[PDB]
Design a binder for these strands. Structure first.
Length: 458
DNA sequence: AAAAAGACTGAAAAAT
DNA sequence: AAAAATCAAAGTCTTTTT
């Protein structure tokens, strides 16, 4: 269970489309052409992005072009058949202009809207869960627009539709006043599931996944998970030795399987690679993680740059960010990597008999609550802790120590670091927490800030 | 088993 | 005064369906 009482106001739907001004025009093959409202709206999306690289990608241009056409009238389809013939320049000029306008505004102008914004947030940015009011992270529904997929996402440029109340599922307690939908509408459904943490959800049309409206990080519901998250990592700390000794043993098994996971566990532990869940071949942008590494991403070097037994990792991880690395591994690991590449083709899984489910199942068996990602938290937290002891100058000046903080903070993000660690250091050294964590971080880390002392040790 | 369904960081805008 | 400086996709992991 996640709560007992949950009463909130529902989402803020996207502002309705504002038709272009008459003077603002669109040209096709030199000719002028007034676009159907729907076709117009979609075109503005593209127009506002002509100043962006997205518009230079062929995947984007095509995905946009096709989707735009599905919204055109029958005649528009007949005419507009070449993107290269469409002229969005004037539309583009307009929006840029509009943006300039908002920049060149009176303080009188600026303040009004600023207060306008405060009225929405005060009303729709909070909810009541149990005894207290809580802040909501994202209370507005994602506006329609063009999909900004990262990397070579095969769907970038696709049209994200406008979410109606009819697509919205509301969640709140049974005894709560149900938020009423916009006049003339209905929610998709209303449920009272005290097992989930979300207030609102809906299915996004581009990938068919479910989007949710949840609470601020400073939430008890959120905060509590984070607290639990670091605890789990602390527990790994104790069992890591036992764990490292076991997979270090599995490196010599008569079961490539036992060996496949062990090696992967190694990299994860040692290099902090991500689990690597399989992604839909042809529906997503190809990035990989540990378990999903392919033969082609690894290249072994018996000896290299004076280094002996080097593994040359070269692939695209999360967000299509390239991970290149030369890693001197332990012999049995290096060799095992040869065994794993034997008679395989590049386009093949390195860890053919392994997956995140399998791996995590094993980790769980080793310690309840242990999943791959825990190694990233654990590795990051411990490093900062130890680098803080080692680098903090015991007779320092508040600002330089903060440097020490950065230096310690170098070899190691607000996500993989038990905040209590920084909370401890700041007290022991009398460095105001305010000096490291800003208002919001203090908001978010209030729990670590209050339940940890100069004596804290991750 | 495994797929499918479900529940939890980048980058752009805003804050002399 | 003005200008220059400092939200939502994409993963992981769990639960349900097949």
């Amino acid at each position: 269970i996640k709560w007992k009482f949950l009463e909130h106001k529902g989402p803020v739907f996207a502002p309705p489309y504002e038709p272009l001004p008459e003077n603002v025009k669109f040209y096709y093959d030199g000719k002028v052409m007034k676009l159907s409202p729907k076709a117009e709206e979609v075109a503005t999306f593209f127009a506002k992005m002509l100043d962006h690289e997205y518009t230079t990608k062929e995947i984007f241009r095509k995905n946009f072009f096709k989707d735009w056409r599905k919204e055109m009238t029958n005649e528009e389809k007949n005419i507009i058949t070449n993107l290269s013939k469409c002229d969005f320049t004037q539309m583009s000029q307009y929006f840029k202009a509009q943006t300039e306008a908002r920049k060149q505004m009176s303080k009188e102008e600026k303040l009004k809207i600023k207060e306008e914004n405060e009225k929405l947030l005060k009303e729709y940015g909070f909810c009541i869960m149990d005894n207290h009011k809580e802040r909501i992270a994202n209370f507005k529904i994602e506006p329609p627009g063009l999909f900004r997929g990262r990397g070579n996402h095969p769907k970038m440029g696709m049209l994200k539709r406008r979410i109606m109340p009819e697509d919205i599922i509301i969640n709140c307690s049974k005894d709560a006043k149900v938020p009423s939908p916009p006049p003339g509408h209905k929610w998709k459904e209303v449920r009272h599931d005290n097992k989930v943490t979300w207030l609102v959800s809906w299915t996004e049309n581009i990938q068919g996944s479910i989007k949710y409206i949840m609470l601020n990080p400073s939430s008890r519901i959120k905060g509590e998970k984070d607290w639990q998250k670091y605890e789990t990592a602390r527990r790994l700390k104790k069992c890591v030795d036992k764990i490292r000794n076991q997979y270090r043993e599995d490196w010599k098994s008569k079961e490539m399987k036992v060996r496949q996971r062990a090696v992967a566990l190694y990299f994860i532990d040692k290099l902090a690679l991500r689990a690597g869940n399989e992604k839909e071949e042809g529906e997503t942008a190809d990035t990989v993680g540990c378990c999903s590494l392919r033969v082609e991403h690894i290249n072994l070097h018996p000896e290299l740059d004076g280094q002996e037994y080097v593994v040359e990792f070269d692939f695209l991880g999360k967000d299509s960010i390239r991970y290149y690395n030369k890693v001197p591994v332990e012999k049995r690991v290096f060799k095992n990597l040869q065994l794993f590449m034997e008679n395989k083709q590049p386009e093949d899984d390195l860890f053919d008999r392994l997956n995140t489910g399998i791996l995590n199942k094993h980790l769980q068996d080793l310690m309840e609550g242990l999943t791959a990602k825990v190694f990233r938290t654990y590795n990051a937290s411990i490093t900062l802790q130890q680098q803080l002891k080692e680098l903090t100058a015991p007779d320092e000046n508040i600002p330089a120590k903060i440097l020490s903080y950065n230096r310690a903070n170098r070899a190691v993000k607000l996500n993989y670091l038990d905040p209590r660690i920084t909370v401890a250091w700041c007290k022991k050294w009398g460095v105001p927490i305010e000096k490291i964590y800003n208002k919001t971080q203090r908001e978010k880390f209030a729990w670590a800030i209050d339940m940890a002392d100069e004596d804290y040790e991750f």
